[PDB]
Each structure stands twice: as structure tokens, then as C-alpha cells.
Design an enzyme around this catalytic site. Structure first.
Site, PDB file in Angstrom:
ATOM      1  N   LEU D  39       0.822  -1.201   0.000  1.00 45.07           N
ATOM      2  CA  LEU D  39       0.000   0.000   0.000  1.00 45.07           C
ATOM      3  C   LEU D  39       0.860   1.257   0.000  1.00 45.07           C
ATOM      4  O   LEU D  39       1.978   1.278   0.523  1.00 45.07           O
ATOM      5  CB  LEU D  39      -0.965   0.024   1.187  1.00 45.07           C
ATOM      6  CG  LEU D  39      -1.697  -1.250   1.617  1.00 45.07           C
ATOM      7  CD1 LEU D  39      -0.902  -2.030   2.616  1.00 45.07           C
ATOM      8  CD2 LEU D  39      -3.067  -0.909   2.188  1.00 45.07           C
ATOM      9  N   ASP D  40       0.316   2.311  -0.599  1.00 42.47           N
ATOM     10  CA  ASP D  40       1.012   3.583  -0.730  1.00 42.47           C
ATOM     11  C   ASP D  40       0.954   4.353   0.589  1.00 42.47           C
ATOM     12  O   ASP D  40       0.567   3.825   1.637  1.00 42.47           O
ATOM     13  CB  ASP D  40       0.471   4.339  -1.956  1.00 42.47           C
ATOM     14  CG  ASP D  40      -0.725   5.271  -1.660  1.00 42.47           C
ATOM     15  OD1 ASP D  40      -1.273   5.803  -2.648  1.00 42.47           O
ATOM     16  OD2 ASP D  40      -1.168   5.453  -0.511  1.00 42.47           O
ATOM     17  N   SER D  41       1.356   5.622   0.543  1.00 39.43           N
ATOM     18  CA  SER D  41       1.325   6.457   1.737  1.00 39.43           C
ATOM     19  C   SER D  41      -0.100   6.635   2.246  1.00 39.43           C
ATOM     20  O   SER D  41      -0.358   6.538   3.451  1.00 39.43           O
ATOM     21  CB  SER D  41       1.969   7.811   1.439  1.00 39.43           C
ATOM     22  OG  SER D  41       3.265   7.900   2.004  1.00 39.43           O
TER      23      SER D  41
END
Ligand SMILES: CCCCCCCCCCC[C@H](O)CC(=O)SCCNC(=O)CCNC(=O)[C@H](O)C(C)(C)COP(=O)(O)O
Lengths: 115, 115, 209, 85
Positions: D39-41
Site C-alpha cells: 500500500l502507498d502512503s
């Protein structure tokens, strides 16, 4: 004062039935606050000058109507209102300390206004 | 020169924090603005628009700029929450009436003179 | 008289205003940068941004200054100078009826402290600047957009902003609502080339380099 | 039905299921959100708002920065709900 004036004419403030002692106490307080202010500051010189002048005239002439005349500040109520504002100003910029030199010069040509 | 004044955030970390609960508010908002404004938008396709707008300004690295986007989104949030905004302005983000714009050079050449 | 067309010159007000300018310059040397009085008897004070609250308070409170009226508050965008935006405060005196002007400078990002407390009239004026020039004001009670349309962008009075804006709005039956569309004029604004190439006023000539 | 560590285990996994991006097969107890789970930020924050609504509480921010692996999720809910089975 004879018959105390009913309304000063400005609805933002009422009549002070004993104005002379108010002038005295506020002027003494602001003179104290200026005594706090360092000697070299020009603010202390100018404000002490005008305030000691004002205190001299208010303690000299005890008629309120002539007090407004030689005080050139309209009704005595707006005069003690302005005195409170002057006290507030001196107190507020006690710690602002503007007597120091300029914080820094404007960047290059920031005031010439032919473009 | 390099030294500058902040708005709120000191470093990328704290501005990174502010965008975090800005996205928090947008997430918790989207469903009940869909409900309240009688949106034709759906919940998921409401959230992903927020995500894509947040990703739109991915290149920004100056702190002060990040405080500026976060406070402008804050104003956006107030405009949406208390129904000052109107349904048309909410749709404005979704480009419905705007016809699809080609991307390849060949289509650009076919359409008309434009880089 | 000999000069029936030229406006009258009032040197007494000029000298008296210059005296008050020296006064205010001496009182607050911390923020004041450059005070000067125009030919038509209008004094302007160029102060550092940090003096937005102090100087104004000194002008609002001092017995010998006595300025309590915020005539207007304005920004004048000029892209050339390093800090493009310049903010002008216009004050009018009652006991000592006169008009004073204090001017500060800021760029797009460096915030300038919000007066409001010194003059509660500034509030709405304050909002206008933020909503019209991008000059954010520190700890302003409510710096929401004030004039422009909802969900707007940019700050129109910026000299780079085009005259016609970027996007109009109109009815669309396909979506049954007013929609926003990129600008497409029916007739383009003709920009006339005025300002003849001959010098007008020798007095205000820019020095060479 | 007393609160249990196993209950929080299964509830965290079940509510991680609903997130569209995550592939269930590579989801594990120690699946790192940044690298392993990928998952991204913002998506780390995304399942942060998926946590407290389902268990029924409030999530602060300084923890939500740290809470990355599902182990951290479950034991932070554990000591917040004083979970010791
Ligand atoms: C649905 C219609 C209404 C709603 C319409 C959509 C919302 C409109 C209002 C908000 C629009 C605004 O441009 C975005 C904002 O709020 S702020 C700036 C975002 N850009 C950055 O901050 C830098 C790049 N991004 C990163 O550095 C990280 O990826 C991130 C910070 C995202 C998370 O990092 P963390 O997690 O570590």
C-alpha cells in the site's frame, strides 16, 4: 460641574460624574508605565511630555467645561477613553520594544514606483 | 534567501500529518455529502476522486506550499460541510460535459494546431 | 489667478504632515522603513511586515496620533518586485482629521499578520485580499473566500491572471445542471497598444544604468 | 462475550478483507504495508479509517503513523482495549 451633563452625545460611552480624579489616576499610571520604558526611547520622551502637560492643565483648572476647552479633546468622557487607550498602547508595546533599530532593509528596489 | 517563514508546518513530516486528517475528513464526508446533496456520484467513485485530487499535486515539495494546499482544502471542506457549496460546484470536479481530450500526437495533428 | 487650471498647492499641510512623519519615524524605528509625503499632501509610511500590528496600534491608540477609522484595505500586485504583493492600510483621523497610509510588502507565500484586532473593519477587507491576491493572513479569525464564486481557483487580481478567466458556466441538459467549461470566447478581447513611445513627464524619469 | 486477542485477530483480518487493493493471499500477519502488502502512503491511512469504525472507537494520528503491520494493529487495539484474554 453644576448640573451634570445628561449624555455626552456619543452613545458608545456614558458620563463620568467625577472626571478630575480619573484624569489624575490614569495619567499617573501611564507616567509610571513610561517610567518603566527606557530613557533613550523617543516614545517615552514624547508621551511623558504630552501627559505631564495634560496632567498639569487638568490639576490646574478645576472647571470641567474649561477642562474640555483647553484639553481640545471634546467631552471629558472621550478624553478619559483616549487616556485609557494610551495606557493600553504603552503597556502593549512595552514588550514589543520598537526602540531597537530596523529589523532589516527592504529587498533591493521594493519602493520605487515607476515600474 | 534559502531561509523562509513557515505558515504552520515546520518540516515535511508535520505537513504530511495535516494532509492526513484532511483526507480523514474527506473520507468521512463523501458518503453523507452524497446523501445530503442528492449526488449522482457513487460512494466509491466519490472517494477515488478525492484520492486522485490528492495525488494530483504529488510533485509539491516546498513546505509553505503544502500548508497552502492544506488550508485551501480546509476552505473547501467548510464550503462543502455546511451546504454553502451547491451541487453543481460539487459536480464541477467531475468533468461530465467536458468532451474527452485526445493524448497521442497523431490525434493532436488530426484535430488542429496545438502542442 | 495666473494659474486658474493648475490645482492649488497647500504647503502648510505638507510641512505639518512631514513633521508628523518624522514623529512617527522616530517613535517606531523597528518596523518603519521609509516615510514620504506626496506632492498633493498625502503621506505614506513604508513599514516592515512584522509591524502590521504594532504600528497600526500606535496609530490607533496614541494620543498624539488618534487614528480610529479603517478607510480601506487593499493589495496592489506588481510581479516585478521580489515580494510581488504590497498591502496598503488607509487610516483617517477624527480628532486630527487627516489621511495616513501605511504600506507593507509580502510575496505569495510569506504570510502577513492579520490586523483584525487593531481594526475590526479589516476583517472583511482582509478576506478580500486572501480571496483576491493569494496573500494569506496569519491567525485571521475566518479567512474563507469572500467575493469570487464557489470552488473558484487562483486569485483574479493577480496581473498574470487573464482578463477573461479560465472557465465559464452554462446550462447543460445532458446533465440537467449548470456546468463549468474551459474558456472559449465568441470574440477575443482586442488589446490596444496605447502608451505612445514618447516620454511624458521628465520629472519622474528613471535613472539610467 | 469477553474481549479476546483472537477476536481482534479475526476481526482485523475480516475487515482488512474489504479493502479492494490488498490481495488476500499475500496478506499475512507480518505483511508489511509499505513493501510486502504494497500500500502507498495514503492507503496505510485508508485502512486506519477502516479500523476504528468497525471496532467502534477513535484513532489518533501519532499512532496511525506507526500502525503499519496487522500485528501492530491488533496489539495496539489490545492495549487500548486492555486486551489480555
Ligand atoms: C469528492 C469531491 C470533493 C473533494 C475533491 C477532492 C479534494 C479537494 C481538496 C484537496 C485538494 C488538494 O490538492 C490535496 C490536499 O488536500 S493536500 C496536498 C497533497 N499532496 C501532498 O501532500 C504532496 C504529495 N503527496 C505526498 O507526499 C503523500 O503521498 C501524501 C501527502 C499524499 C500522503 O503521505 P503520508 O501518507 O506519508
Amino acid at each position: 460641574a453644576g448640573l451634570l451633563k445628561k449624555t455626552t452625545g456619543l452613545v458608545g460611552l456614558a458620563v463620568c460624574e467625577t472626571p478630575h480624579e480619573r484624569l489624575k489616576i490614569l495619567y499617573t499610571k501611564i507616567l509610571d508605565v513610561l517610567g518603566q520604558i527606557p530613557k533613550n526611547a523617543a516614545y517615552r520622551k514624547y508621551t511623558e511630555q504630552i501627559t505631564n502637560e495634560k496632567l498639569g492643565m487638568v490639576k490646574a483648572e478645576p472647571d470641567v467645561k474649561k477642562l474640555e476647552e483647553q484639553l481640545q479633546g471634546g467631552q471629558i468622557e472621550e478624553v478619559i477613553l483616549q487616556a485609557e487607550n494610551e495606557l493600553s498602547l504603552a503597556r502593549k508595546m512595552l514588550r514589543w520594544k520598537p526602540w531597537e533599530p530596523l529589523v532589516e532593509e527592504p529587498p533591493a528596489n521594493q519602493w520605487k514606483w515607476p515600474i | 534567501g534559502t531561509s523562509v517563514k513557515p505558515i504552520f508546518s515546520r518540516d515535511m513530516n508535520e505537513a504530511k500529518r495535516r494532509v492526513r486528517e484532511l483526507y480523514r475528513a474527506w473520507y468521512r464526508e463523501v458518503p453523507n455529502t452524497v446523501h445530503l446533496f442528492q449526488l449522482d456520484i457513487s460512494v466509491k467513485q466519490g472517494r477515488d476522486k478525492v484520492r486522485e485530487m490528492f495525488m494530483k499535486n504529488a510533485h509539491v515539495t516546498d513546505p509553505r506550499v503544502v500548508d497552502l494546499l492544506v488550508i485551501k482544502g480546509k476552505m473547501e471542506l467548510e464550503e462543502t460541510i455546511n451546504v454553502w457549496k451547491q451541487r453543481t460546484h460539487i459536480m464541477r470536479f467531475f468533468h461530465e460535459t467536458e468532451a474527452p481530450r485526445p493524448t497521442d500526437f497523431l490525434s493532436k495533428f488530426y484535430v488542429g494546431h496545438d502542442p | 489667478d495666473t494659474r486658474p487650471t493648475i490645482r492649488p498647492r497647500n504647503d502648510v499641510v505638507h510641512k505639518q504632515l512631514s513633521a508628523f512623519g518624522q514623529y512617527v519615524a522616530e517613535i517606531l524605528p523597528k518596523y518603519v522603513q521609509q516615510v514620504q509625503v506626496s506632492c498633493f499632501n498625502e503621506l505614506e509610511i513604508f513599514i516592515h511586515p512584522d509591524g502590521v500590528i504594532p504600528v497600526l496600534t500606535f496609530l490607533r491608540d496614541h494620543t498624539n496620533a488618534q487614528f480610529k477609522s479603517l478607510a480601506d484595505l487593499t493589495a496592489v500586485d506588481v510581479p516585478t518586485r521580489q515580494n510581488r504583493f504590497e498591502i496598503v492600510y488607509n487610516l483617517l483621523s477624527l480628532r486630527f482629521n487627516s489621511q495616513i497610509r501605511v504600506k507593507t510588502y509580502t510575496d505569495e507565500l510569506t504570510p502577513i499578520e492579520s490586523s483584525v484586532t487593531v481594526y475590526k473593519a479589516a476583517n472583511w477587507y482582509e478576506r478580500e485580499i486572501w480571496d483576491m491576491f493569494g496573500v494569506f493572513f496569519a491567525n485571521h479569525p475566518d479567512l474563507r473566500r469572500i467575493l469570487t464564486g464557489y470552488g473558484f481557483e487562483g486569485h483574479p487580481f493577480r496581473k498574470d491572471f487573464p482578463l477573461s478567466g479560465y472557465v465559464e458556466l452554462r446550462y447543460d441538459d445532458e446533465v440537467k445542471r449548470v456546468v463549468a467549461e474551459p474558456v472559449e470566447l465568441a470574440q477575443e478581447f482586442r488589446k490596444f497598444d496605447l502608451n505612445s513611445p514618447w516620454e511624458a513627464f521628465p520629472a519622474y524619469r528613471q535613472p539610467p544604468e | 462475550p469477553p474481549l479476546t486477542l483472537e477476536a481482534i485477530k479475526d476481526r482485523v483480518l475480516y475487515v482488512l478483507k474489504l479493502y479492494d487493493k490488498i490481495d488476500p493471499e499475500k496478506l499475512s500477519v507480518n505483511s508489511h504495508f509499505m513493501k510486502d502488502l504494497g500500500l502507498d502512503s495514503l492507503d496505510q491511512v485508508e485502512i486506519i479509517m477502516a479500523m476504528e469504525d468497525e471496532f467502534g472507537f477513535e484513532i489518533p494520528d501519532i499512532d496511525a503513523e506507526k500502525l503499519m503491520c496487522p500485528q501492530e494493529i491488533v496489539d495496539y487495539i489490545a492495549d487500548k482495549k486492555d486486551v489480555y484474554e
